[PDB]
Amino acid sequence: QPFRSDGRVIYCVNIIYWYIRLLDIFGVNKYLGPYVMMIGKMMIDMMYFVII
Amino acid sequence: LGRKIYEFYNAPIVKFWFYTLAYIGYLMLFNYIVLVKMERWPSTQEWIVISYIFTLGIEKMREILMSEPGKLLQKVKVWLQEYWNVTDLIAILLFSVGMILRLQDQPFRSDGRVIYCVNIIYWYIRLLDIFGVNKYLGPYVMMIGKMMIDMMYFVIIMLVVLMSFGVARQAILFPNEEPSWKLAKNIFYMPYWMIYGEVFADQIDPPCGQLPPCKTGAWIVPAIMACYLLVANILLVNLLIAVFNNTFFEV
Amino acid sequence: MLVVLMSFGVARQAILFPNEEPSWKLAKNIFYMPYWMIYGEVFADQIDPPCGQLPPCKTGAWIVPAIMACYLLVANILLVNLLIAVFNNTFFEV
Numbered sequence: 530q531p532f533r534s535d536g537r538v539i540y541c542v543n544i545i546y547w548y549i550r551l552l553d554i555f556g557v558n559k560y561l562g563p564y565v566m567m568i569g570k571m572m573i574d575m576m577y578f579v580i581i
Numbered sequence: 582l583g584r585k586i587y588e589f590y591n592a593p594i595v596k597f598w599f600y601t602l603a604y605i606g607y608l609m610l611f612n613y614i615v616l617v618k619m620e621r622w623p624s625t626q627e628w629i630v631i632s633y634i635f636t637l638g639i640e641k642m643r644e645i646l647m648s649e650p651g652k653l654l655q656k657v658k659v660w661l662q663e664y665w666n667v668t669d670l671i672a673i674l675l676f677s678v679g680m681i682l683r684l685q686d687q688p689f690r691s692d693g694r695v696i697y698c699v700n701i702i703y704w705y706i707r708l709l710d711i712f713g714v715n716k717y718l719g720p721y722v723m724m725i726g727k728m729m730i731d732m733m734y735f736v737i738i739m740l741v742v743l744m745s746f747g748v749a750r751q752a753i754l755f756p757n758e759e760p761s762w763k764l765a766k767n768i769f770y771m772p773y774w775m776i777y778g779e780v781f782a783d784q785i786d787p788p789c790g791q792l793p794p795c796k797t798g799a800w801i802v803p804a805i806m807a808c809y810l811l812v813a814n815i816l817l818v819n820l821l822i823a824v825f826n827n828t829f830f831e832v
Numbered sequence: 833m834l835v836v837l838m839s840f841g842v843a844r845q846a847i848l849f850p851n852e853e854p855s856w857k858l859a860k861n862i863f864y865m866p867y868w869m870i871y872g873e874v875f876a877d878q879i880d881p882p883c884g885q886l887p888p889c890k891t892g893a894w895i896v897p898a899i900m901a902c903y904l905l906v907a908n909i910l911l912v913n914l915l916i917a918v919f920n921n922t923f924f925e926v
């Protein structure tokens with residue numbers, strides 16, 4: 530301690546990333562892949578929206 | 582006059598409206614018996630509802646027997662090819678199970694009440710099913726179907742994002758909960774009502790250390806809360822705006 | 833919407849509050865609670881209050897969060913978006 534709780538925090542943000550990798554693997558499905566590229570282009574447009 | 586009354590009452594539109602009025606009265610008496618009490622023996626309204634269900638089951642057996650094929654398993658499969666017949670049979674067995682439980686003593690009576698409520702849910706969905714006769718409601722019904730499929734795929738993606746945020750929140754804050762099934766309750770509880778309005782303003786960054794001491798990374802939870810709800814609400818909800826608009830053109 | 837909302841309200845007021853005698857306030861509750869549930873405020877205090885730890889839990893008190901989630905989900909998203917699409921395709925003709 531106190532580095533153990535910091536390691537726990539890093540473990541949680543890595544969970545976040547590995548669920549995003551589970552979102553990445555959904556490009557095999559023909560119904561989820563279009564939604565994934567929606568997430569990408571809508572993320573760019575929301576970056577400009579987030580500025581305004 | 583006898584030919585007049587017999588020619589009137591055998592008309593299919595008269596049959597449709599009489600069945601609709603009887604279904605309306607059925608839904609009324611079902612509402613009455615799920616709000617008002619039940620004892621060791623049922624009331625007259627609940628006996629009428631039981632009679633409704635059992636005669637509907639007898640009529641469904643008449644539908645199965647008097648169909649077009651001649652083999653028993655073939656005509657049963659032909660009748661079960663329709664989805665509404667499948668859910669109707671599931672509800673009939675559910676009501677009979679609930680009535681068997683309710684005719685027994687406590688604590689099975691409250692379980693029968695629970696089954697009665699979820700059967701109410703189903704019979705209101707059947708009232709939604711009957712709205713395919715109207716030229717203005719039928720398009721809305723097929724919207725409900727195709728939008729339900731698209732929301733199933735949306736619910737998969739939303740469930741991934743929401744589950745990740747809930748796991749991160751319940752692992753940063755509350756860092757000392759032993760193995761219990763209530764952890765899943767928390768991670769599915771908090772973000773799901775976070776989407777829909779109420780952000781739980783008291784629960785986000787409560788004052789600590791000024792009060793219990795702050796957990797390590799307690800400031801990370803406002804940041805991942807902001808990031809999660811942001812991309813969740815705006816990205817996926819708008820996404821569903823675009824999805825349901827491009828579904829409506831074809832329909 | 834009235835069909836779906838009425839079914840959820842009847843189910844909620846029949847699972848929870850299982851001991852209310854015949855009174856016209858039952859209709860008040862079943863039209864009260866889901867209608868403001870749609871529009872914002874989800875009544876966070878009233879959903880899964882701690883019981884048995886406090887009055888004992890009614891049977892199936894855990895079913896009300898599930899049917900709450902299912903109801904508002906399909907209610908809010910399915911019908912409200914549906915009205916987005918409906919009002920967009922009305923605006924073209926007008």
Ligand SMILES: CC(C)CCC[C@@H](C)[C@H]1CC[C@H]2[C@@H]3CC=C4C[C@@H](OC(=O)CCC(=O)O)CC[C@]4(C)[C@H]3CC[C@]12C
Nearest residue numbers: 551740741744748759760761762763764765766768769
């Ligand atoms: C990835 C998606 C599709 C599902 C995510 C599910 C998780 C939220 C679940 C699945 C595995 C679950 C765990 C499986 C085992 C247990 C032991 C369980 O312990 C007991 O019930 C006490 C008795 C015993 O230890 O056997 C408490 C819940 C817990 C930690 C569960 C917590 C919730 C978890 C992580």
Ligand SMILES: CC(C)CCC[C@@H](C)[C@H]1CC[C@H]2[C@@H]3CC=C4C[C@@H](OC(=O)CCC(=O)O)CC[C@]4(C)[C@H]3CC[C@]12C
Nearest residue numbers: 733734736737740761762763764765766767769770894
């Ligand atoms: C692929 C998609 C469409 C699946 C959608 C369904 C799931 C998101 C649902 C169905 C079954 C649900 C589970 C059914 C039962 C429980 C036990 C429940 O345990 C408690 O609440 C603790 C005990 C208690 O306090 O009653 C926690 C939620 C959980 C894991 C539920 C989490 C959400 C689940 C996985």
Ligand SMILES: CC(C)CCC[C@@H](C)[C@H]1CC[C@H]2[C@@H]3CC=C4C[C@@H](OC(=O)CCC(=O)O)CC[C@]4(C)[C@H]3CC[C@]12C
Nearest residue numbers: 579580786787788789795799800801803804805807811
């Ligand atoms: C996306 C655009 C349009 C707006 C920008 C939003 C975020 C950049 C803001 C909104 C909420 C903010 C957070 C609100 C509260 C806190 C807690 C604060 O920590 C504390 O007050 C001490 C620890 C604690 O008590 O939790 C650190 C900054 C932080 C994470 C803020 C960081 C910046 C955030 C994430």
Ligand SMILES: CC(C)CCC[C@@H](C)[C@H]1CC[C@H]2[C@@H]3CC=C4C[C@@H](OC(=O)CCC(=O)O)CC[C@]4(C)[C@H]3CC[C@]12C
Nearest residue numbers: 605608609612613616617838854855856857858859862
């Ligand atoms: C299906 C749609 C279109 C309407 C749904 C309406 C229901 C919510 C209503 C219609 C029938 C009503 C019931 C009709 C009769 C009564 C008796 C009533 O009792 C009294 O007023 C006391 C005096 C007496 O018993 O006559 C209390 C309300 C109650 C249970 C009503 C509760 C609310 C109900 C179920």
Ligand SMILES: CC(C)CCC[C@@H](C)[C@H]1CC[C@H]2[C@@H]3CC=C4C[C@@H](OC(=O)CCC(=O)O)CC[C@]4(C)[C@H]3CC[C@]12C
Nearest residue numbers: 833834835838854855856857858859860861862863864
């Ligand atoms: C087909 C659609 C478009 C019809 C839309 C109208 C209905 C949804 C409204 C119109 C009349 C309303 C009813 C008028 C009066 C009452 C009595 C009211 O009784 C009480 O609140 C108890 C007494 C009290 O505390 O004042 C409960 C709601 C109810 C049944 C209302 C429920 C909602 C109703 C049926």
Ligand SMILES: CC(C)CCC[C@@H](C)[C@H]1CC[C@H]2[C@@H]3CC=C4C[C@@H](OC(=O)CCC(=O)O)CC[C@]4(C)[C@H]3CC[C@]12C
Nearest residue numbers: 736739740766769770773880881883893894897898901
């Ligand atoms: C649809 C996708 C995108 C997200 C998944 C949402 C549901 C699957 C979650 C959200 C709210 C959850 C419920 C929140 C609280 C509870 C109460 C819990 O029961 C108790 O805590 C004990 C009884 C009580 O006190 O009510 C059982 C699990 C349950 C129904 C949970 C089951 C899973 C639910 C319905």
Ligand SMILES: Cc1cc(NC(=O)[C@H](c2ccccc2)N2CCCc3ccccc32)no1
Nearest residue numbers: 597600601603604607633634637640707711
């Ligand atoms: C109990 C109970 C259910 C019920 N009603 C029906 O389940 C249904 C119906 C619903 C609304 C309007 C009209 C009819 N119905 C009755 C006879 C079998 C059948 C076949 C095909 C389509 C509908 C239908 N009445 O009492």
